Amino acid sequence: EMGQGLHTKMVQVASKALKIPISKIYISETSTNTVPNSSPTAASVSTDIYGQAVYEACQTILKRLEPFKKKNPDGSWEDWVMAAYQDRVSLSTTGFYRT
Amino acid sequence: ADELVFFVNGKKVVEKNADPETTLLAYLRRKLGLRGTKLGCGEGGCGACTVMLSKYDRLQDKIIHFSANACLAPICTLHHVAVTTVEGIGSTKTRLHPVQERIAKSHGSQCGFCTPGIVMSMYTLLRNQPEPTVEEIEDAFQGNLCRCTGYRPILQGFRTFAKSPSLFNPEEFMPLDPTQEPIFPPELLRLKDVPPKQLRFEGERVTWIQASTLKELLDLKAQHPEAKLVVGNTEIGIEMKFKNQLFPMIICPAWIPELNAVEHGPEGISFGAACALSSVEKTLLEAVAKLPTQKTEVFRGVLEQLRWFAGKQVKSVASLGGNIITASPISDLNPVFMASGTKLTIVSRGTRRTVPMDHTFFPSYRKTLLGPEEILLSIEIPYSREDEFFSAFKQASRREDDIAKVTCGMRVLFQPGSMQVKELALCYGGMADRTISALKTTQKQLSKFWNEKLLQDVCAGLAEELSLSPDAPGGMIEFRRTLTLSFFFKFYLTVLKKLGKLDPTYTSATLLFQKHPPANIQLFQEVPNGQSKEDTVGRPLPHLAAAMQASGEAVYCDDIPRYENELFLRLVTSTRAHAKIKSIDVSEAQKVPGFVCFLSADDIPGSNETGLFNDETVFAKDTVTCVGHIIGAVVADTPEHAERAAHVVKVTYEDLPAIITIEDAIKNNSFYGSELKIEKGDLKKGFSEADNVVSGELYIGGQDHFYLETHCTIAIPKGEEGEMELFVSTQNAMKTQSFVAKMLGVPVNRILVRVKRMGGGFGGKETRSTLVSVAVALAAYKTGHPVRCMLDRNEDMLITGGRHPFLARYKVGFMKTGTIVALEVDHYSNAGNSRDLSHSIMERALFHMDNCYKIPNIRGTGRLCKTNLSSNTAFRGFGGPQALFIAENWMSEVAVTCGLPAEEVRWKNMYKEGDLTHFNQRLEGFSVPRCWDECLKSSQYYARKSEVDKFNKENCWKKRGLCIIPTKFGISFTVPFLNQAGALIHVYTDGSVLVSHGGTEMGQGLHTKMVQVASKALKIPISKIYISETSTNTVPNSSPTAASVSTDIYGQAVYEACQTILKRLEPFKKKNPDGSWEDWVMAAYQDRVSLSTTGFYRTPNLGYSFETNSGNAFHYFTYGVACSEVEIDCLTGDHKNLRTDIVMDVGSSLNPAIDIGQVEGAFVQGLGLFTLEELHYSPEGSLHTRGPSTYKIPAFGSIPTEFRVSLLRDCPNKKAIYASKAVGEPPLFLGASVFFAIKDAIRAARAQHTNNNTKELFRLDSPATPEKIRNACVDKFTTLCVTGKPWSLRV
Amino acid sequence: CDDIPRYENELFLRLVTSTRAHAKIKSIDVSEAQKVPGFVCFLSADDIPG
Ligand SMILES: Cc1cc2nc3c(=O)[nH]c(=O)nc-3n(C[C@H](O)[C@H](O)[C@H](O)COP(=O)(O)OP(=O)(O)OC[C@H]3O[C@@H](n4cnc5c(N)ncnc54)[C@H](O)[C@@H]3O)c2cc1C
Ligand SMILES: NC(=O)C1=CN([C@@H]2O[C@H](COP(=O)(O)OP(=O)(O)OC[C@H]3O[C@@H](n4cnc5c(N)ncnc54)[C@H](O)[C@@H]3O)[C@@H](O)[C@H]2O)C=CC1
Ligand SMILES: Nc1nc2c(c(=O)[nH]1)N[C@H]1C(S)=C(S)[C@@H](COP(=O)(O)O)O[C@H]1N2
Ligand SMILES: O=c1[nH]c(=O)c2[nH]c(=O)[nH]c2[nH]1
Ligand SMILES: O=c1[nH]c(=O)c2[nH]c(=O)[nH]c2[nH]1
Ligand code: FES
Ligand code: FES
Ligand SMILES: [Ca+2]
């Protein structure tokens, strides 16, 4: 983030992908121990390329929650997340994109 | 005066404003930034703060070097002293010193928190003696504690300084070269020449005068009679820190020659009162070597007390006069000086007297007869005359570095050439509020002769004159009275021997403690012959951080530098077991300089409701429910200010009825939840079929974790959106993160918890670390400043909970062959004031009540008692050791009842391959029989049993015992959902790899094992792989690092993340099969292939149900066997651990150095649980034992003298990572082999003096401390002493 | 970045830069720098460990 609103857009993207409100999503910072080998934030393409990587990670999370959603279609996001956790489903994933 | 000038690691320090209250430890850590020296206790017991000191001794004309506890050393005693810390001797950035290299390569560092202080104790020995004997090497560490290693590897590594594959290779060790050691600072050597001048230092609260001459001292004492002398500070340090004394003026007379002079006169050897106990010891050892035996009786009594006194660190600074004038009732020296009439020369300006010490010198508790302007100048310890004999004895809870239960000096002088008593003095500590003489008893014997009737009469007289009321401080009434007689008896027999210069069965009672030489053998499996050198799985690779631990470079939480605006928190805690809080007044606390604020329940912005079961407060509101219950916290600019202000917060209470003990709880129906039960088969039928039925009751005491690093959190508030980053000593970053979030009322995504390492956890940082973390977080939130808190040992022991005490009622039915047929055990744990992990702990207890035995009809129940004590928690074993102990106890009773050898009875009841447990789980790959057979053989159990019987026939007052016990321990979290693990792996474009996983390092070598796993999986050297730390923003929702499964589960997750990487790299590998790892990684990167992935694992096929008694509770079991032999002293309760042999099934070890260390470390914690460690509470529920002085974990001298460990060969475990098995907790119960060896020995003592009943069953609870062992050795002396002339008596 | 609180032992660096567009460096004299209160050290190419 250098002022251009990249984190904001990434939060909008994640919230649309997961179908939850932006208020449940947070970006704290950028660091080499969370995402390695990153290109510089440059060439105007950051929304394009991090938007896809974030969207791909959200799709993976949705696939993982999907059986819990079906067992409990009237439950909340919070219910399905807790069910996946008690079922020992990983709630952590990477996302990646290559133009 | 004003300036203080000393040296640290060769560099000059000029402190222009020395505060007399500043310790060297505080100075090193907070002013000089040298954090390798650690705080472990603050009271002289653990040695984690050990440093070397060097000075020019003018008077001896040489540079001397000695060790000292930085936590007790005032910087104001150090003018013109050169200090060496662990950083002064070597480092990984330059080169390790030989001491550091060896402790690291020999696997003598696990968590590493004790390592710098032990390095400095060994370094100091070497600077004094570059080629020490083995015995010198053991004695070097009487003041160093280690909770992790079991001591064996440290001693074995360091023994290379004296004179199966291997866990290390001493041929690679750099020899010591004294010519390369740092030179004594030349500036100090120039200053030696200038005569000293009086110095004055002025601090916030204290003025210190360093007196240069006797005349100065005597004048200062006239001018300021209230001024407190300080020499070594090893008593005043405690008074200041723990007893809240403030002495606004201190005079330190340590420089004065008259107070340091040693003079050999015709009546004895005179020592200046400031002479250190080590100088006393040295001079007397020399005298005993040079002089006739008949002259050195008193000296040898002094020496005998100094042997079992304190470490070298304390002895090198503790002055002789300091001990005399402190005048504790349990001084080990004052009874010796009193019984010998040792001469005290006492001075005042223009006055001077010499008096023999006698009973009047101690008028009352902790006072002597000196007046306020007098000082003790010198002490003349007398030569022994002809016809004069002397003994000193001391019995504590542990031999090394412990407070006497009873201690004494005994002198007799006969008419010339005769057995006719002319003088007799029996002087005791531990029997009143002062050192006392048994004058009434001894008076009656003058002119009597040394014979049986005198022994009987002195015993009867002591029993009467040295009475103790039921309420005597220290408790242990029967033991103490029995020791007073027992010590007289040893004296009486020793004096008979000395007079006949009789009965070979009695002679050992007269023998002074003697060290047998150590023998240690470790047996493990070589890796296959052609396994790649780069594949280190199965090799004895040292802990990756051991070299930095040895160097003081490894960073633990409080070693992290403070921010310039960082504040300090001190908890305010209940002094009542159960009370309403009436009011809280902070008006005095507000006046302490640097006070920032007092925090209490109203300050919390989110929820005050916390704890694993949401049954706790973050800060008590309205009521307190235990002593130590956290009420609030003070925040101030320094830890001293915070502590001072917290001390003066005034709480007003109104007591409520308290439920303290398991008995109170049962009687009051005060339980958490309902009964747990496992039941199989038909009990009525089994009992009705049994030939023999035994029932009983049994208790096992709790256990304090004693991690060398106490609990610690730093909380950094980021000032944006509720964000906070916390560095925490915890095994559970996830609950830390969510409890801090719940308290703040913010989403969990706001909170980052980072754990680099812990200096020990042992289960006590599984949940209870949050008590400190949530308070510190509150403080950071409220102030907007970084805040930290590290607990002092006494806060930690009181507040953070321990192992669960258990009471059991059992009934066992068996056949005359010893075959068990029915068993009922009702378990009760003392849970304290919240649920925490108590339920799962009781479950695991029930799961382990069979140990290794097939029992067709069985019913176990468990209740959790709800009490007004700190909530008890996970402690290595997690309920298993308590249940396994109850099981071996009835089993031992079965063997005694049947009159069968115990190993036969154990063997015939043992499960076989394929049996179901009582919870219907099948035992596959049950390796106990192999461990059992191989341990019998390699321990020479059978041959040794005959040797033990022989020893017992031939010794009336010492007995040996021998016992071999199996164990099995189920591997998995008993809560199914906990058995999951994540990893995150990145490969950077230089081809270096950063691994992160949900597990934490607490000394067990998890990261080491994870790097070994990733290296094997990726087929790259370990040098390319690195683990920095554990954090919630790299792996989320981690289970606590616990249940011994961390290697199994994180190993799988790491494995999987590597497989993913290998698959992404495979095309590049195919294109360039002769290229390097680096080539492939760069090509993957240039091809825009991701080099980052997660890995995950969930343990398959788990899910036990208590309702159906089916489904797998565990993934597999770890197994092992231990045989131990002991010798007990039936007259004192002391015992030696002679030999232990362990055979442990850890499958195909990933790292046999680390696995043997875990075996030995767990075993020794077990040994402490069952034989040494005991917590004492007042009847009102206030903990008495709050530091290493009174709570005694195994010392270096505690371990078995011959200590052999073997890892079972050819037992791959297909259920875990590379065929390995969990090791962390399974071996701890094996320390119960020492307890049952002790009980075997007690049975032999009781056959000797108590009973003819060879099927008698006497109750021995855990721990079997000297108290319990001596009291069970019922004999003519205990008979005279057991508590409880009426006008009439029925019959 | 600079809003992050400093550690209590945290030091400050000031770059020393060329006043010439293209020249040989003949010598560097730090002897006056060394007298400024709080001076800790001057760093240059030779201090670089890698
Ligand atoms: C870890 C540890 C283990 C210990 N183990 C034992 C043990 O096994 N047995 C045992 O008996 N003790 C034991 N002690 C107590 C120890 O021996 C005493 O703490 C020590 O000798 C006191 O000497 P000091 O120079 O440190 O006294 P300081 O603390 O400096 O002074 C202690 C007291 O003596 C006074 N004093 C000192 N010099 C004079 C003087 N010349 N004239 C008049 N008053 C003076 C001081 O004013 C103060 O009241 C232990 C202490 C520690 C810390
Ligand atoms: N810190 C350590 O590791 C060690 C310290 N030392 C000495 O141990 C001392 C311990 O100090 P404290 O714990 O304050 O104990 P203390 O000096 O008050 O003595 C307590 C003991 O005195 C006896 N006692 C006191 N009053 C009595 C009474 N009215 N009736 C019968 N017995 C009574 C009992 O033996 C009790 O256990 C230290 O100050 C030090 O001098 C010795 C060994 C180890
Ligand atoms: N040195 C050391 N060893 C230790 C501990 C420790 O705190 N320090 N904790 C023990 C406990 S209680 C457990 S559950 C395991 C946890 O680690 P693991 O799961 O990697 O064995 O290590 C055991 N061995
Ligand atoms: O093609 C580009 N490469 C960059 O490294 C860069 N940086 C900037 O925004 N524009 C670009 N464009
Ligand atoms: O079943 C267990 N649960 C735990 O939470 C825990 N902690 C400890 O190591 N052992 C165990 N065992
Ligand atoms: S911290 Fe100094 S001896 Fe423990
Ligand atoms: S390594 Fe000694 S306490 Fe941990
Ligand atoms: Ca509890």
Side-chain angles (χ1 to χ4, degrees), chain B residues 611-613 615-616 625-630 672 703-705 707 711 763-764 767-769 771 796-805 830-839 841 865-875 1177:
Chain B
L612 205 54
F613 290 85
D615 55 348
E616 308 176 19
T625 63
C626 69
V627 182
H629 198 171
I630 291 153
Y672 291 116
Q703 200 177 9
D704 184 77
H705 298 94
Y707 23 65
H711 290 261
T767 54
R768 307 310 286 171
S769 62
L771 302 182
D796 196 291
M797 295 184 74
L798 176 65
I799 292 168
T800 71
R803 200 179 283 285
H804 278 74
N830 196 326
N833 81 339
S834 69
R835 291 159 185 79
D836 192 63
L837 291 156
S838 298
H839 190 94
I841 282 152
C865 307
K866 169 172 177 234
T867 57
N868 302 103
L869 295 173
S870 302
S871 187
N872 285 325
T873 189
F875 190 138
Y1177 300 85

Side-chain angles (χ1 to χ4, degrees), chain B residues 41 43-46 69 72 74 142-143 217 221 227-239 247 251 253 259 272-277 305-306 308-311 314-315 317-328 330-335 345 347 366 368 370-371 374-379 394 399-404 407 1188-1189 1192:
Chain B
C41 68
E43 50 168 87
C46 73
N69 296 295
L72 290 179
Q142 188 170 333
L217 174 56
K221 278 295 284 183
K228 251 293 202 242
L229 269 53
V230 168
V231 177
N233 200 47
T234 62
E235 162 69 25
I236 294 304
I238 300 297
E239 287 180 21
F247 304 102
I251 294 153
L259 282 152
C275 290
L277 295 186
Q305 297 305 65
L306 297 174
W308 305 120
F309 195 100
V314 168
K315 288 190 302 167
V317 307
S319 76
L320 208 221
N323 185 274
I324 293 163
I325 298 305
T326 291
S328 166
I330 47 73
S331 171
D332 294 300
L333 302 182
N334 282 338
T345 295
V347 297
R366 280 181 178 249
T368 66
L370 314 207
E374 293 179 318
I375 59 101
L376 172 60
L377 175 63
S378 49
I379 295 101
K394 164 175 179 168
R399 272 195 305 282
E400 295 75 12
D401 187 16
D402 202 9
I403 296 157
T407 186
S1189 48
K1192 321 304 298 191

Side-chain angles (χ1 to χ4, degrees), chain A residues 24-26 28 32-37 39 64 85-94 96 98-99, chain B residues 721 723 749-750 976-977 979-980 986-989 994 1033-1034 1036-1037 1085 1087-1088 1090 1092 1096 1098-1099:
Chain A
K24 298 193 186 155
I25 304 176
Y26 192 72
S28 177
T32 49
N33 75 349
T34 51
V35 176
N37 309 317
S39 302
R64 294 199 189 155
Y85 172 74
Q86 317 226 291
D87 205 52
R88 296 183 286 157
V89 168
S90 166
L91 294 168
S92 187
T93 185
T94 57
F96 192 80
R98 163 154 91 176
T99 305
Chain B
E721 284 291 343
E723 288 196 61
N749 63 15
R750 297 308 203 273
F977 74 71
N979 296 284
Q980 55 174 291
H986 311 308
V987 188
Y988 295 102
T989 58
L994 177 62
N1033 70 354
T1034 52
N1037 313 321
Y1085 168 74
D1087 212 40
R1088 300 178 279 157
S1090 176
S1092 184
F1096 193 83
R1098 75 174 168 199
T1099 310

Side-chain angles (χ1 to χ4, degrees), chain B residues 867-1145:
Chain B
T867 57
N868 302 103
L869 295 173
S870 302
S871 187
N872 285 325
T873 189
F875 190 138
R876 195 177 199 170
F878 195 83
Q882 297 93 313
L884 291 157
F885 175 67
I886 293 156
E888 287 303 343
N889 178 72
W890 59 247
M891 177 67 70
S892 66
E893 284 174 343
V894 172
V896 167
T897 304
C898 290
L900 294 170
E903 80 280 351
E904 281 174 21
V905 177
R906 292 193 162 91
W907 170 249
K908 74 178 69 176
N909 280 298
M910 181 161 298
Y911 285 122
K912 51 177 214 315
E913 180 68 34
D915 290 345
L916 306 190
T917 64
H918 53 303
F919 52 95
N920 286 321
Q921 176 163 358
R922 189 185 172 77
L923 299 160
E924 318 185 279
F926 185 73
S927 67
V928 182
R930 278 189 65 202
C931 295
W932 180 260
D933 294 318
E934 139 164 17
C935 188
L936 287 168
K937 177 177 205 307
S938 70
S939 64
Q940 308 211 57
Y941 177 84
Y942 294 110
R944 284 212 286 148
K945 204 170 104 196
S946 322
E947 164 253 288
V948 156
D949 299 333
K950 196 179 186 313
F951 181 94
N952 284 354
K953 248 169 246 135
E954 284 164 18
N955 292 265
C956 176
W957 304 104
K958 280 181 172 30
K959 298 290 183 184
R960 287 184 183 177
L962 175 77
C963 176
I964 182 181
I965 61 156
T967 193
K968 85 184 197 305
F969 189 93
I971 303 308
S972 268
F973 285 96
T974 58
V975 168
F977 74 71
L978 290 172
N979 296 284
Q980 55 174 291
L984 181 69
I985 302 200
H986 311 308
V987 188
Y988 295 102
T989 58
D990 63 341
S992 70
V993 176
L994 177 62
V995 170
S996 178
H997 60 87
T1000 57
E1001 179 61 41
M1002 56 195 102
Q1004 82 281 42
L1006 179 50
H1007 291 330
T1008 303
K1009 281 175 162 172
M1010 296 300 97
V1011 167
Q1012 292 178 262
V1013 164
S1015 151
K1016 176 175 175 63
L1018 294 168
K1019 296 176 278 325
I1020 71 189
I1022 54 166
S1023 56
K1024 278 154 183 204
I1025 303 165
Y1026 191 72
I1027 298 177
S1028 176
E1029 68 180 38
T1030 308
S1031 44
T1032 53
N1033 70 354
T1034 52
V1035 179
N1037 313 321
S1038 62
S1039 300
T1041 301
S1044 312
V1045 299
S1046 307
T1047 310
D1048 293 14
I1049 63 176
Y1050 299 109
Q1052 297 281 170
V1054 168
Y1055 181 75
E1056 297 296 351
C1058 293
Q1059 291 319 301
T1060 297
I1061 294 316
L1062 284 181
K1063 290 173 175 178
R1064 291 188 182 165
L1065 295 181
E1066 180 66 12
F1068 305 93
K1069 191 184 142 134
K1070 278 182 189 170
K1071 284 204 261 281
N1072 185 17
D1074 290 323
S1076 65
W1077 165 258
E1078 290 77 24
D1079 292 327
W1080 302 326
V1081 168
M1082 184 59 83
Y1085 168 74
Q1086 309 252 30
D1087 212 40
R1088 300 178 279 157
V1089 168
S1090 176
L1091 297 149
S1092 184
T1093 192
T1094 58
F1096 193 83
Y1097 180 76
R1098 75 174 168 199
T1099 310
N1101 299 313
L1102 292 182
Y1104 176 77
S1105 164
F1106 278 80
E1107 290 159 60
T1108 70
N1109 200 203
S1110 55
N1112 290 328
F1114 312 106
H1115 193 50
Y1116 61 92
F1117 300 80
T1118 288
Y1119 302 108
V1121 173
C1123 177
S1124 290
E1125 181 183 4
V1126 300
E1127 178 185 296
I1128 64 168
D1129 184 328
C1130 307
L1131 283 173
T1132 66
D1134 186 46
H1135 82 281
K1136 292 164 130 156
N1137 291 332
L1138 295 178
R1139 175 167 175 176
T1140 288
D1141 289 67
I1142 301 169
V1143 179
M1144 199 81 44
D1145 167 20

